[PDB]
Amino acid sequence: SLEEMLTQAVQEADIEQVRQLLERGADANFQEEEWGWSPLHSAVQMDSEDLVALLLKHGADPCLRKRNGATPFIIAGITGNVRLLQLLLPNVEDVNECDVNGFTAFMEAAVYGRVEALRFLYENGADVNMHRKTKQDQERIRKGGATALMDAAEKGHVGVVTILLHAMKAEVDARDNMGRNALVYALLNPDDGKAKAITRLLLDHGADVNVRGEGSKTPLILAVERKNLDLVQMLLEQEQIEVNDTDREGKTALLLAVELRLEEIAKLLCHRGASTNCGDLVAIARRNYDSDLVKFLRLHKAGPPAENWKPQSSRWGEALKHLHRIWRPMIGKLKIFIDEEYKIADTAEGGIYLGLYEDQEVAVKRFSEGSTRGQQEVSCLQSSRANDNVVTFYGSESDGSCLHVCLALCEYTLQEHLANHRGDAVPNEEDESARNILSSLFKAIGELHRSGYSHQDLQPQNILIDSKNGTFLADFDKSIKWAEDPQKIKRDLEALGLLVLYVVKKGDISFETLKNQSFEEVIQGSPDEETRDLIHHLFHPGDNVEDRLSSLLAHPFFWSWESRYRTLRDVGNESDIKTRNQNSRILQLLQPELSTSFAQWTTKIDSFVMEEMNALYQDTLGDLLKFIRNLGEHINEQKNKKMKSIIGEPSQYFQEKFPDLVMYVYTKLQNTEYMKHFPKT
Amino acid sequence: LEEMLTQAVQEADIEQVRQLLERGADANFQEEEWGWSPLHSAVQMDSEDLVALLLKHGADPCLRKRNGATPFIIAGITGNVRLLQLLLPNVEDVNECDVNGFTAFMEAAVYGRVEALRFLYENGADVNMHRKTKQDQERIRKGGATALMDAAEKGHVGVVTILLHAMKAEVDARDNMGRNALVYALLNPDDGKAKAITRLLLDHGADVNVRGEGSKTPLILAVERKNLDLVQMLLEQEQIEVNDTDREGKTALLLAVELRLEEIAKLLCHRGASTNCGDLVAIARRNYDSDLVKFLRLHAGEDFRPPAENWKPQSSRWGEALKHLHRIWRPMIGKLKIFIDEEYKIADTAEGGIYLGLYEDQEVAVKRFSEGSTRGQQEVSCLQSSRANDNVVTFYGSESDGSCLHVCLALCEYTLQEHLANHRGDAVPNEEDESARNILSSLFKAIGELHRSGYSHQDLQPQNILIDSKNGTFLADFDKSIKWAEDPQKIKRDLEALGLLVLYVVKKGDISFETLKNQSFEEVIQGSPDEETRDLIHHLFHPGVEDRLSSLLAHPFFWSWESRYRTLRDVGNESDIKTRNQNSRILQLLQPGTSELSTSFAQWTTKIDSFVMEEMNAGNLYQDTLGDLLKFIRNLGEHINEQKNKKMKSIIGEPSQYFQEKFPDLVMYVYTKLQNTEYMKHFPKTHN
Numbered sequence A: 001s002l003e004e005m006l007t008q009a010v011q012e013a014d015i016e017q018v019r020q021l022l023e024r025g026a027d028a029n030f031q032e033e034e035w036g037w038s039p040l041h042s043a044v045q046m047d048s049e050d051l052v053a054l055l056l057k058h059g060a061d062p063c064l065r066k067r068n069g070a071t072p073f074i075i076a077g078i079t080g081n082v083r084l085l086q087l088l089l090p091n092v093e094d095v096n097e098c099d100v101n102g103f104t105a106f107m108e109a110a111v112y113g114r115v116e117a118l119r120f121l122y123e124n125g126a127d128v129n130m131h132r133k134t135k136q137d138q139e140r141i142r143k144g145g146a147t148a149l150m151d152a153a154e155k156g157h158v159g160v161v162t163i164l165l166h167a168m169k170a171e172v173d174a175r176d177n178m179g180r181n182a183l184v185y186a187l188l189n190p191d192d193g194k195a196k197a198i199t200r201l202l203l204d205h206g207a208d209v210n211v212r213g214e215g216s217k218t219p220l221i222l223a224v225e226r227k228n229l230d231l232v233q234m235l236l237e238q239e240q241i242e243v244n245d246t247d248r249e250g251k252t253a254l255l256l257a258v259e260l261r262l263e264e265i266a267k268l269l270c271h272r273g274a275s276t277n278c279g280d281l282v283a284i285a286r287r288n289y290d291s292d293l294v295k296f297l298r299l300h301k302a303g304p305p306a307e308n309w310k311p312q313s314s315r316w317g318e319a320l321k322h323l324h325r326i327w328r329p330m331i332g333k334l335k336i337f338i339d340e341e342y343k344i345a346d347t348a349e350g351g352i353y354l355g356l357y358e359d360q361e362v363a364v365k366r367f368s369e370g371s372t373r374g375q376q377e378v379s380c381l382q383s384s385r386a387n388d389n390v391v392t393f394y395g396s397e398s399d400g401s402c403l404h405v406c407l408a409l410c411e412y413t414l415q416e417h418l419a420n421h422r423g424d425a426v427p428n429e430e431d432e433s434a435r436n437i438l439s440s441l442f443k444a445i446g447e448l449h450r451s452g453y454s455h456q457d458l459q460p461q462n463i464l465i466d467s468k469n470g471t472f473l474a475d476f477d478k479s480i481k482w483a484e485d486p487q488k489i490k491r492d493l494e495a496l497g498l499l500v501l502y503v504v505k506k507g508d509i510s511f512e513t514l515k516n517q518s519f520e521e522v523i524q525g526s527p528d529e530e531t532r533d534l535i536h537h538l539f540h541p542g543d544n545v546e547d548r549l550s551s552l553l554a555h556p557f558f559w560s561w562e563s564r565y566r567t568l569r570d571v572g573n574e575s576d577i578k579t580r581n582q583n584s585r586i587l588q589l590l591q592p593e594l595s596t597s598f599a600q601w602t603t604k605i606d607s608f609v610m611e612e613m614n615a616l617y618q619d620t621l622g623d624l625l626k627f628i629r630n631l632g633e634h635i636n637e638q639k640n641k642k643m644k645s646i647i648g649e650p651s652q653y654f655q656e657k658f659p660d661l662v663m664y665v666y667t668k669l670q671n672t673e674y675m676k677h678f679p680k681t
Numbered sequence B: 001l002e003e004m005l006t007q008a009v010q011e012a013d014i015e016q017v018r019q020l021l022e023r024g025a026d027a028n029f030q031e032e033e034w035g036w037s038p039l040h041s042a043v044q045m046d047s048e049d050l051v052a053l054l055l056k057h058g059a060d061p062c063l064r065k066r067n068g069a070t071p072f073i074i075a076g077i078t079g080n081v082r083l084l085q086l087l088l089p090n091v092e093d094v095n096e097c098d099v100n101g102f103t104a105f106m107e108a109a110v111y112g113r114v115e116a117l118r119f120l121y122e123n124g125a126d127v128n129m130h131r132k133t134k135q136d137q138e139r140i141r142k143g144g145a146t147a148l149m150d151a152a153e154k155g156h157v158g159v160v161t162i163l164l165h166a167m168k169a170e171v172d173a174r175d176n177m178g179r180n181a182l183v184y185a186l187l188n189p190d191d192g193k194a195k196a197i198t199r200l201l202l203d204h205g206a207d208v209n210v211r212g213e214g215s216k217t218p219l220i221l222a223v224e225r226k227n228l229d230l231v232q233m234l235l236e237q238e239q240i241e242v243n244d245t246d247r248e249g250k251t252a253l254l255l256a257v258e259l260r261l262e263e264i265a266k267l268l269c270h271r272g273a274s275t276n277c278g279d280l281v282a283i284a285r286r287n288y289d290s291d292l293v294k295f296l297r298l299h300a301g302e303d304f305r306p307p308a309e310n311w312k313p314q315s316s317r318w319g320e321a322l323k324h325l326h327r328i329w330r331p332m333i334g335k336l337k338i339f340i341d342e343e344y345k346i347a348d349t350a351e352g353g354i355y356l357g358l359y360e361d362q363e364v365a366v367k368r369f370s371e372g373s374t375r376g377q378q379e380v381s382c383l384q385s386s387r388a389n390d391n392v393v394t395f396y397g398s399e400s401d402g403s404c405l406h407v408c409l410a411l412c413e414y415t416l417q418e419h420l421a422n423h424r425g426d427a428v429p430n431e432e433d434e435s436a437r438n439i440l441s442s443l444f445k446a447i448g449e450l451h452r453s454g455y456s457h458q459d460l461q462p463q464n465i466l467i468d469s470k471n472g473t474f475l476a477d478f479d480k481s482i483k484w485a486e487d488p489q490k491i492k493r494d495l496e497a498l499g500l501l502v503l504y505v506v507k508k509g510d511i512s513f514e515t516l517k518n519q520s521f522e523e524v525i526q527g528s529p530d531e532e533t534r535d536l537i538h539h540l541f542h543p544g545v546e547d548r549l550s551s552l553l554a555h556p557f558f559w560s561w562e563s564r565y566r567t568l569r570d571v572g573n574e575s576d577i578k579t580r581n582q583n584s585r586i587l588q589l590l591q592p593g594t595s596e597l598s599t600s601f602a603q604w605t606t607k608i609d610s611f612v613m614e615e616m617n618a619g620n621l622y623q624d625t626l627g628d629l630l631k632f633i634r635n636l637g638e639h640i641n642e643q644k645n646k647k648m649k650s651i652i653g654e655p656s657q658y659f660q661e662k663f664p665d666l667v668m669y670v671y672t673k674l675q676n677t678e679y680m681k682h683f684p685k686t687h688n
């Protein structure tokens, strides 16, 4: 708290207080730990020589380095007051001392366009053609190696560039580690005037014009993309320039000029040997409605690639092949055309259209760029990237006024998918597919809740099936961060219960019908007790922060018919069931209501089968599980083949005859030691 | 073959056009892709001669192509007015539209065709008409723009002042988004043309507190453009609100300070801009903007609080560093926030290293390459084709600056190597290793799906495998990957590295990976602790030939110990095993020939404790056949827990572990004998 007010005093520029505290013993080489700023560093930055003098009076080191390795000498280059540089030079071991990224005081004078300061340092031994030596991580990615001229050229300081080349013997064709010269730095400056002057200077000194910058672009290409005919003329004056150089994308300087609607620039390029075998220029000019340029390319005319690209979607394959072939302007990384041929579906605002994002096929959901709906969709999607059962999110792109959200393209909606597979199974077979779809949804919605989000509009058109029969949740425009109202999670759970019934009924019942039913009507329409119990627990959940849904994945609804039969057999093999030990812990657990279908169960079984098993079966639950265990073990023997014919497949037998059995046993043993007999879930 | 009907019109030789008309050829024929008529194409090329010849052979001048454009409206762009006068006698309405709402008048406004614009004006063209578009694009508030808005955007100064002063153009007409011509004007790259147009629109009363994209006002747009002049012209209005904010919450002054523009900052303060929209002095100080810091100091951020840190990381290993990176100030590289400093460094690479980052405010790992790097290009190519692969590290995106490719990936806790070290103590010496199975089955799926996607990894090792906070395994690092279609045989080296990884993970990391790569295939197999592992690794070193991986997920290596025991019990309960019917199909599968020699279960009745062997005896005596051992296992399984057999239960312990240790080859033997038979039914259900 003493050095603290020394620091505070220097920023307010209260000079007496600075003297007082140095007299009082305040450390002038105190470095704040976040970024390493010294009071001498901060003094040079604010340009107050009075403060620079008083601190130096009290032994403050002028080559003390902050986090980036900069000394208050190097910071003086940035300030560009020469009398500060005078005051510190007597103490500085090397005038070419650099920071961790290789910046010297002379470079910093070049960067900040400090003419008076760069002269001073020039006379005092500064290296003019110094390249920046940086840390090893940065050099292995070929960063660094820039020079004072490149910095001056990029920031457009014409004053500084002139002096460097003429007065200071600056190398014009010095390169950085990536291979760039000052010419390419010069051509990236937004101001046309300053760019024009600097390129002229650099050219006359012998700056190479066949060099490669970002995107493998040449100087000429950069000048064309800038739309500046002047810089094109200057670079065309050199004859050893390669006019038919191509960037990373395979585009040539002429091609871009035609594409960019630049008549003057196009003609001038042709009249300097630019080949017209780079692309179909007249189609491009025709598309741009430049009649005059079409004529020119035609009057100069004397007399296409191969289409590699293949879509992975088979439903959308032919339309994507078309969209890939046509020309469209890019919206960032997105290629899209708003036409019914490329439309997937209709929405509350904008529609779903096929698109290409980074040349990958996607579904593009459109919103107005201001839309609250568009904001919640993107916010929820960007938190869901680890949720395997949520549709993959590529990215969002905006133009003037439309937010495009790009998503993984799926084959079918849940509804369509159920329709296509509706004739696959015979009427009364076990429905594995309903389990897979629903367990996927439970995980999807459960993970979304752990993410802090609730969907708020779960229905079969928001659920998509990919080429490999995976189920994915989509459409988060009405989603909410559920901490805002934790009780609206129940709406997700209710829609899940309707989706349970919807999928179990193979889509024969519409979702609209099901939403118009009451809870009791939904339970009645359920074909079995497992489904009934599950839907019940979704409408009457417990209380959980996205733990609830994963728990219900252990519910016997998601147990196969073999696993259900296996659990009843395993329970019926407990010692105390076979010995009918009625004080036992197991039988006390199955102790007890509403007349179950297995009360008086020995009467409901075929009398031949009942007779032969007896080799004393009472109407207890314990005795029925023993019955199931025994039959399970001996059903396949030669001795029992008539029994086997009457029973058929045993799992289905007991379940049809006693529909509440599995659920009853599950409820009695669910939080007990005998849970171990349940299938692994 | 009549493809000259329109090849002739584009070559503009009229000799072949007139003669083509009387040679079995139509004039209103529309090519199906875009709908271009020869009359459409004639007007676009500005040929008075071709439009004349075709129209005196009946060609309809209100014929539409795909966007609903007529040859009339497309005359609006070309601007030639005597083609407009040749076609007007044949057109019902001069305000006719294309599907996007565009008139012949606005296309004249867009292309700055002054002489064409006034022709249409005095022929009744509506100057204040807004575009009526398709219902899709109106529901996202697109369309509704004016001829003035088009003139303003394209910078045509001539056209703007004629519209305002000759043609009674509404200056504050809005589009469906809520924009006026002022905001269209300020998006124009040319400073001069922008200056002139803004002046005109301002003097006629164009609202200056409008909102465009991003909820930016005209003033904010002028500051972001770095143009002092447009700023002064805007603040000449007194009704303007200088403290209007954008959607990001920032105001015109704050941006000016952030952007290093003391000119514009000072002028803004001198016109009522509040100085508590941000800590301006800290911002100017960080920009080394000495004179600006002095200025703001004389007046600044005394009454301003920066929002309290309402952001929490999900990673616990990297939590502390991400909290710091969220707090500090950094410039954005597109959607990426990163700082290259050792505090935020995750690992070293051969190019650039791995650093913590924030991408769309999500924590990520940022792998850096040279923007030219071939290895950087293969990494993103393979990542972009793996977005559906659940067991590949999630790919957020790539960002480039001047000269560095940043690849942003899901942040994981630990490397496979680190993870096996931390959990080395978790299992008891002789208990089942579930974790080895989960890790390996995830890798099998990962590499399998990567192959279906057309890629091979080519450098599988434990440093390229990451574990997340929920113990899920993810494959990463595809800088050396290849499209295997060029050379389909090189996926075998992925399957070899998988073989090594199997042994590596089963040994809980105690044998190094370098050791294992220096071993031969036979040495690796002999180092395996059980026959399941041995068999699996064998099938990875000798695979082929393609989707071996998916099939191997059914291998008994991935069967739990309960399931292994369950299938031995279920095979042992077959009728023909209990009756010892040796002619049966099952026992002909199991124990055919002269005998079952050279296996730990030859004379198996001798290897079992004599108490338990005795008490199991109720022919009629367990023989040294495999059939009788599975019967043995079935019988014990059913009665082991009964009160009468408590002592047997204590000698045996957990029965699955018992039989596997005393007969290590048993499970694999039964598997091999029954694997493509009907008795496959007894195997556990595996992955679909």
Ligand SMILES: Cc1[nH]c(/C=C2\C(=O)Nc3ccc(F)cc32)c(C)c1C(=O)NCCN1CCCC1
Residues within 6 Å of the ligand: A344, A345, A346, A352, A363, A391, A407, A408, A409, A410, A411, A412, A413, A416, A461, A462, A464, A474, A475
């Ligand atoms: C309402 C609907 N949504 C979708 C699809 C998506 C949807 O709503 N969101 C999506 C996000 C990504 C993606 F790949 C697809 C969708 C479809 C294909 C449909 C649909 O079914 N469209 C009409 C064709 N069928 C359904 C009724 C009879 C006609």
Ligand SMILES: Cc1[nH]c(/C=C2\C(=O)Nc3ccc(F)cc32)c(C)c1C(=O)NCCN1CCCC1
Residues within 6 Å of the ligand: B346, B347, B348, B354, B364, B365, B393, B409, B410, B411, B412, B414, B415, B418, B463, B464, B466, B476, B477
């Ligand atoms: C070699 C290595 N790679 C990583 C991490 C990743 C890695 O190599 N690739 C990744 C991609 C995504 C991601 F989230 C993480 C990585 C770490 C943390 C390490 C590591 O172990 N760093 C500390 C080095 N210490 C640990 C043992 C002695 C060296």
